[PDB]
């Protein structure tokens, strides 16, 4: 639905501005969109979604063993775990358990 | 009495290159608090007047973004808690600045940008026609 | 010995005619022991008064302007005048600016708080030029207006070229200038197929 | 909390001394600094956007506060 | 040290999806067009289907980074509605208040 | 009944600070925010990473200065700088405070890759706003 | 290092601390530039936008040309990839089609 | 007609900060800036002055020891522009071959 002049002028502008020049249907135009943006998996929000829980947990555990961080929570579960040994509710040996 | 006799001033060297010309600087600042934007405007305007810069201030309309959440941890869908984030604006429009003047003023007010306040500086630069466009080659 | 006793606040040694900019030279948190003002803050209880400044977390939460008093600002700008250059007196009005400098380049910088300064919006460059400032004949002007499309505004007669293809702002600026060049020269070229108009 | 008359007297002396510093900070005449200039200075120096004005920083004469 | 095994499985999926993103993008482009021969496009269909299952991006789940809740998560903060409210109601999220109008 | 962040009335003997005495519907009316950054402004990025940093810093400082903090932290961010303002008590010796300030400022600067400052304000005892 | 020690003194005020950080590279340099320290290998704009030079090994005409022209058009519009990353995409296609030449020949498509 | 454009002025990255610092003088009422400006923490003697700085330096040394002892915890680079000075230091030789 375009004149020869309009069609050839639209094709010239496409070459000038770096757009697709050959006649391409909407299906094949996805190839242009695929390479014009980063894949969803490559975006920082995706692969850096979680904070590195290893670094945080391991750092604050080391700082506790060094005496520079007081972990009120870990102290709470160390007192509970300590009272369960005196009460007899101690974790069994792996493999040499109640069942066999 | 214990006053420094002489003070070492920072070295500013006039270069041999022409300076950039800025038609307009639009310093848009965002903040959750209006009073902080009022104090910052008083600062930035007073700084411009003392440096000889032409500044005009206007307040763009505020934007409030609201969203709803469930109030209970489990069931009770009818009951919701609604939160909002208010964004207030103040647009500082400078005019007829030079590259050096803009660099100094922007550094001065950006370094004094109070916590919780953002900035978006739109710099319109006056330019001349490229040498290639002066005349057609065909 | 007895427990260490805190010294009295140093606001008691401050003269009423001191050089305040020397006390708060740069942005610092509100220190009740350094600010000689009986400022109070806090919603008062029934038959109560706003809380005093010592241990007042509300005053600590405010971004104060104690380092930017009118005296300090005027003294600061006096030292910063050496860095400024003088706007060309010839370019008095905007019409004069357009005549001598037809092209206008808009760029934006974003100042946010955080460890990273990167912002993907800063790469965008906008180039505006009125087609009346370009040496375009009748044919060239008509061909240009058709090539650019909606980038041209007939009311203002301004051609706006926005470029954000390249990672950097300097690359997008070079691309915006290049697009204007090829558009100008291509508009002047007359092709044989143009006779089918 | 009970505010005895001696305590109030010490609060007034503090306001008068603080009033002179605030004029010195803002670069105004300590002798013509009024209560409306005090409010303008505190609003600039301690910008508070709290919707309730009774929660904002205030520097008033003890007679009007207590 | 992640919140639970479910978070740990998503951490591995996000890592594997990142490693294969380029290879998957290149092969998919061969499939998402009508230009190339159907014989070549059929081989690409098998190649992307043979890649490890955890490299498929659709298997990633936006869980709460603090509690691992798979639903009720706000994408801007990556927090579950319960964790976000706990921080917001204590005045610890800059600029977020209760909405009333 | 609403529960969120409400210290509930007792027999009139529970001292509460000014922050603890105000329920969530006062966060922009009578009390301010304990953290100021730009992430939550319109059109701003990285709100998620700013939040995780705030949550960590509040836990790091609670365990690094055990029993010393007299109220909640005030986290301030200006450009690249991070400022932690803490109201502490006057029980721990000054030497130990200076050690912990130099230690926490250095350790946190290397962890979040930015200049970090810690501004301590000492109070003789916890500031009581009212008795609930 | 000894010459630095003799001139070494403690920070005198807030401004001096800001200066030291700026010199050490800890604090940002103002006015804020969002591209400070990031250069895409000093690549020119033409390197990013015009990528047809890399398509010379490929057939000058045919379906592969059209497909690869679309690939380069997308890559030219990508501001998140460096020039090096964009060439990697094209190189991978050069190898892929080299491995599938037998299939391409069955489809009457000549590659290389 | 010709318009004369003013010559650009170039200064060092710290010039503006240095210009602002020249305007301020020493505050006679305050102790040296290095010390914590707090009545309880301010040094109250020539000995305290020395000890307070030494304690602060000790804290910095302890942190540096931990940073270099466990580099893994401080290897996530989130700074833009990159800050080399805030990265862990590796003092052990990484080349194990016996060669010149
Ligand atoms: Mg899903
Ligand atoms: Mg209800």
UniProtKB/Swiss-Prot annotation, chain B:
Report which superkingdom the organism of origin falls in: Eukaryota
- Does this UniProt record's set of keywords contain Mitochondrion? yes
Which interval of the chain is the signal sequence? Answer: none
Q: Where are the transmembrane segments?
A: none
Q: Which UniProt keywords apply?
A: Mitochondrion, Ribonucleoprotein, Ribosomal protein
Kindly state a single biological-process term from the GO annotations of this entry: mitochondrial translation
The Gene Ontology CC terms held by the record are: mitochondrial inner membrane; mitochondrial matrix; mitochondrial small ribosomal subunit; mitochondrion
Subcellular location as annotated: Mitochondrion
Family recorded in the similarity comment: Belongs to the universal ribosomal protein uS10 family.
Assembly: Component of the mitochondrial small ribosomal subunit (mt-SSU). Mature mammalian 55S mitochondrial ribosomes consist of a small (28S) and a large (39S) subunit. The 28S small subunit contains a 12S ribosomal RNA (12S mt-rRNA) and 30 different proteins. The 39S large subunit contains a 16S rRNA (16S mt-rRNA), a copy of mitochondrial valine transfer RNA (mt-tRNA(Val)), which plays an integral structural role, and 52 different proteins.
| Name of the protein described by the UniProt record | Small ribosomal subunit protein uS10m
> From what organism does this protein derive?
Homo sapiens (Human)
Which part of the full protein is shown? 52 to 189 of 201
UniProtKB/Swiss-Prot annotation, chain D:
Transmembrane annotation, as ranges? none
Show the disulfide pairing.
none
Subcellular localization is given as: Mitochondrion
Superkingdom of source:
Eukaryota
Subunit-structure text:
Component of the mitochondrial small ribosomal subunit (mt-SSU). Mature mammalian 55S mitochondrial ribosomes consist of a small (28S) and a large (39S) subunit. The 28S small subunit contains a 12S ribosomal RNA (12S mt-rRNA) and 30 different proteins. The 39S large subunit contains a 16S rRNA (16S mt-rRNA), a copy of mitochondrial valine transfer RNA (mt-tRNA(Val)), which plays an integral structural role, and 52 different proteins.
Q: Which family does it belong to?
A: Belongs to the universal ribosomal protein uS9 family.
- The protein here is known as Small ribosomal subunit protein uS9m
UniProtKB/Swiss-Prot annotation, chain E:
Supply the alphabetized keyword list.
Disease variant, Mitochondrion, Primary mitochondrial disease, Ribonucleoprotein, Ribosomal protein
A GO molecular-function descriptor? structural constituent of ribosome
Q: Name one GO cellular component term.
A: mitochondrion
Subcellular localization, as worded in the UniProt entry: Mitochondrion
This protein's assembly is summarised as: Component of the mitochondrial small ribosomal subunit (mt-SSU). Mature mammalian 55S mitochondrial ribosomes consist of a small (28S) and a large (39S) subunit. The 28S small subunit contains a 12S ribosomal RNA (12S mt-rRNA) and 30 different proteins. The 39S large subunit contains a 16S rRNA (16S mt-rRNA), a copy of mitochondrial valine transfer RNA (mt-tRNA(Val)), which plays an integral structural role, and 52 different proteins. Interacts with LIAT1.
Q: Name one GO biological process term.
A: mitochondrial translation
Q: Provide the protein name.
A: Small ribosomal subunit protein uS14m
Task: Indicate the span of the full protein covered.
Answer: 28 to 128 of 128
Q: Which organism is it from?
A: Homo sapiens (Human)
Which disorder is recorded?
A: Combined oxidative phosphorylation deficiency 38: An autosomal recessive disorder due to mitochondrial dysfunction and characterized by perinatal hypertrophic cardiomyopathy, growth retardation, muscle hypotonia, elevated lactate, dysmorphy and intellectual disability.
Swiss-Prot record, chain G:
Coiled coil region boundaries? none
**Subcellular location(s) per record:** Mitochondrion
Q: What is the designated name of this protein?
A: Small ribosomal subunit protein mS31
Gene behind this protein: MRPS31
The record's comment on protein family reads:
Belongs to the mitochondrion-specific ribosomal protein mS31 family.
Task: Tell me the subunit arrangement.
Answer: Component of the mitochondrial small ribosomal subunit (mt-SSU). Mature mammalian 55S mitochondrial ribosomes consist of a small (28S) and a large (39S) subunit. The 28S small subunit contains a 12S ribosomal RNA (12S mt-rRNA) and 30 different proteins. The 39S large subunit contains a 16S rRNA (16S mt-rRNA), a copy of mitochondrial valine transfer RNA (mt-tRNA(Val)), which plays an integral structural role, and 52 different proteins.
């Amino acid at each position: 639905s375009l004149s020869e002049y309009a069609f050839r002028m639209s094709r010239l502008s496409a070459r000038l501005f770096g757009e697709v020049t050959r006649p391409t249907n909407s299906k094949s135009m996805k190839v242009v969109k695929l390479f014009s943006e980063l894949p969803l998996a490559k975006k920082k929000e995706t692969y850096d979604w979680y904070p590195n829980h290893h670094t945080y947990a391991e750092l604050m555990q080391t700082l506790r063993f060094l005496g520079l961080y007081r972990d009120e929570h870990q102290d709470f579960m160390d007192e509970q775990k300590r009272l369960k040994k005196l009460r007899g509710k101690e974790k069994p040996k792996k493999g040499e358990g109640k069942r066999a | 009495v214990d006053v420094p006799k002489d003070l070492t001033k920072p070295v500013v060297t006039i270069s041999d290159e022409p300076d950039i010309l800025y038609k307009r600087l639009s310093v848009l600042v965002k903040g959750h608090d209006k009073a902080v934007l009022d104090s910052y405007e008083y600062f930035a305007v007073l700084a411009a007047k003392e440096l000889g810069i032409s500044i005009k201030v206007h307040e763009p309309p505020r934007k409030i973004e609201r969203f709803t959440l469930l109030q209970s941890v489990h069931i009770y869908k009818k009951h919701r808690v609604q939160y909002e984030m208010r964004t207030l604006y103040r647009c500082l429009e400078l005019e007829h600045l030079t590259g050096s003047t803009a660099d100094v003023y922007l550094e001065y007010i950006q370094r004094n940008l109070p916590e919780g306040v953002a900035m978006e500086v739109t710099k319109t630069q006056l330019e001349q026609l490229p040498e290639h466009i002066k005349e057609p080659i065909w | 010995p007895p427990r260490r006793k805190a010294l009295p606040p140093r606001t008691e040694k401050m003269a009423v005619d001191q050089d305040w900019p020397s006390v708060y030279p740069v942005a610092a948190p509100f220190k009740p022991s350094a600010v000689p003002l009986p400022v109070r803050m806090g919603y008062p209880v029934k038959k109560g008064v706003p809380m005093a400044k010592e241990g007042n977390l509300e005053l600590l939460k405010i971004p104060n302007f104690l380092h930017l008093t009118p005296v300090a600002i005027k003294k600061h700008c006096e030292a910063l005048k050496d860095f400024c250059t003088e706007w060309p007196a010839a370019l008095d009005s905007d019409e004069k600016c357009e005549k001598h400098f037809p092209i206008e380049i808009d760029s934006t910088d974003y100042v946010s708080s955080g460890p990273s300064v990167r912002n993907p919006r800063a790469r965008v460059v906008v180039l505006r030029v009125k087609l009346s400032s370009l040496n375009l004949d009748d044919h060239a002007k008509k061909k240009l207006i058709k090539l650019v499309g909606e980038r041209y505004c007939k009311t203002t007669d301004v051609l706006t070229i926005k470029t954000d293809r390249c990672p950097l702002r300097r690359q997008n600026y070079d691309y915006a200038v290049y697009l204007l060049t090829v558009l100008y020269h291509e508009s002047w070229n007359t092709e044989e197929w143009e006779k089918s108009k | 909390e009970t505010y005895t008359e001696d305590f109030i007297k010490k609060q007034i002396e503090e306001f008068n001394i603080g009033k002179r510093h605030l004029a010195n900070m803002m670069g105004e005449d300590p002798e013509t600094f009024t209560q409306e200039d005090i409010d303008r200075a505190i609003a600039y120096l301690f910008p508070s956007g709290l919707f309730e004005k009774r929660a904002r920083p205030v520097m008033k004469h003890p007679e009007q506060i207590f | 040290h992640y919140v639970d095994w479910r978070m740990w499985r998503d951490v591995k999926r996000r890592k594997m999806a990142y490693e294969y993103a380029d290879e998957r993008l290149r092969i998919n482009s061969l499939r998402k067009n009508t230009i190339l021969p159907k014989i070549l496009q059929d081989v690409a269909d098998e190649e992307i289907a043979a890649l490890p299952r955890d490299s498929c991006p659709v298997r990633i789940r936006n869980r709460c980074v603090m509690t691992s809740r798979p639903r009720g998560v706000k994408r801007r903060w990556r927090l579950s509605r319960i964790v976000f409210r706990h921080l917001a109601d204590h005045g610890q999220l800059s600029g977020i208040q209760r909405a009333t109008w | 009944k609403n529960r969120a962040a409400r210290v509930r009335v007792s027999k009139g003997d529970k001292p509460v600070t000014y922050e603890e005495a105000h329920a969530p519907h006062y966060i922009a009316h009578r009390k301010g925010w304990l953290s100021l950054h730009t992430g939550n402004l319109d059109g701003e990025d990285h709100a998620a990473e700013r939040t995780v940093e705030d949550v960590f810093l509040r836990k790091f400082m609670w365990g690094t200065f055990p029993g010393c903090l007299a109220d909640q932290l005030v986290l301030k961010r200006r450009g690249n700088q991070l400022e932690i303002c803490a109201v502490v008590l006057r029980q721990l010796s000054p030497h130990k405070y200076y050690f912990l300030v130099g230690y926490s400022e250095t350790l946190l600067s290397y962890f979040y890759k930015c200049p970090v400052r810690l501004h301590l304000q000492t109070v003789p005892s916890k500031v009581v706003y009212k008795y609930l | 290092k000894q010459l630095a020690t003799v001139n070494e003194q403690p920070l005198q005020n807030g401004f001096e601390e800001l200066i030291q950080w700026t010199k050490e590279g800890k604090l940002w340099e103002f006015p804020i530039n969002n591209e400070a320290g990031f250069d895409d290998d000093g690549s020119e704009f033409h390197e990013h936008i015009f990528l047809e030079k890399h398509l010379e090994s490929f057939p000058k005409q045919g379906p592969i040309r059209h497909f690869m022209e679309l690939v380069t058009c997308g890559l030219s519009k990508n501001p998140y990839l460096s020039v090096k990353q964009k060439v990697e995409h094209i190189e991978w296609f050069r190898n892929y089609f080299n491995e599938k030449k037998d299939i391409l020949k069955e489809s009457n498509i000549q590659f290389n | 007609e010709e318009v004369v454009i003013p010559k650009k002025k170039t200064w060092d990255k710290v010039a503006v900060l240095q210009a602002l610092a020249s305007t301020v003088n020493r505050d006679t009422t305050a102790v040296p800036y290095v010390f914590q400006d707090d009545p309880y923490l301010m040094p109250a003697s020539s000995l305290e002055s020395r000890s307070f700085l030494l304690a602060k330096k000790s804290g910095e040394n302890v942190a540096k020891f931990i940073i270099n002892s466990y580099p893994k915890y401080f290897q996530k680079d989130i700074a833009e522009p990159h800050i080399p000075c805030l990265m862990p230091e590796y003092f052990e030789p990484q080349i194990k071959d016996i060669s010149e």
